[PDB]
Amino acid sequence: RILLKILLTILIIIALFIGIMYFLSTRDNVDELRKIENKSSFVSADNMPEYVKGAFISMEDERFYNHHGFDLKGTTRALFSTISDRDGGSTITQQVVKNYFYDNDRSFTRKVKELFVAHRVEKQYNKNEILSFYLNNIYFGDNQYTLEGAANHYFGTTVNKNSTTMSHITVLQSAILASKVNAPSVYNINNMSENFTQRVSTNLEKMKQQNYINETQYQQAMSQLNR
């Protein structure tokens, strides 16, 4: 029975190991997202075609508005399949937090602070705006980090439903960007591979699957792509 108590001490010590981790979370603030809500090229979600929105949602989080900034079962399955696939499963929120606080370093201990920062944003930000902070903060093909910052670069078009200037966003251009979110740099948006071409089709299929797009619009995104 003495052995079943040493399990305690360890777990309690793992338990407090995660306590201190909270202690650390403090030093970084929640406020950038308004600053990064200003940028050389900026946009908001509620002023973007929904299929652009789902172009990433479906991909990085099938049901992003449903979770409260954490996909505990899919995320577990995620890290359960990372080691078992080497191929989500962190939704859209944390992604921002990652790109926000710690771009240079990767770690588990980082993986943890990360989630404390996950709590701190759904509670300080609506699930539409965080989504947008996501898009106006990420790495695209060339040196672009907002969604609009690459839109004109590559597609010379616009992610604004409103935009009367630079051609309306297309569907068959939107998956390509869900790809982008991690696509660089082995994969390139200028000259693609054969497995590269593979994914967006998958990516699109969910936008169809989870119905961010009806049927008709999908083949017109499955035709112009193979030419």
The answer to whether the CB of 155 falls within 8 A of the CB of 173 is yes
Containing structural domain, residue 112: 1-227
The experimental method, as deposited, was: X-ray
Question: C-alpha 220: how far from its chain's center?
Answer: 25
Phi-psi region of 211 (alpha: psi -120 to 50; beta: other; left: phi over 0): left
Tokens read off for 102: 């710690």
| CATH at 168 | 1.10.3810.10
Q: Half-sphere exposure of residue 205, counting CA atoms within 13 Å on the CB side? A: 5
């499955």: which residue's tokens? 222
The answer to whether the CB of 166 falls within 8 A of the CB of 157 is yes
Tokens read off for 11: 């777990």
**Count of structural domains, the chain:** 1
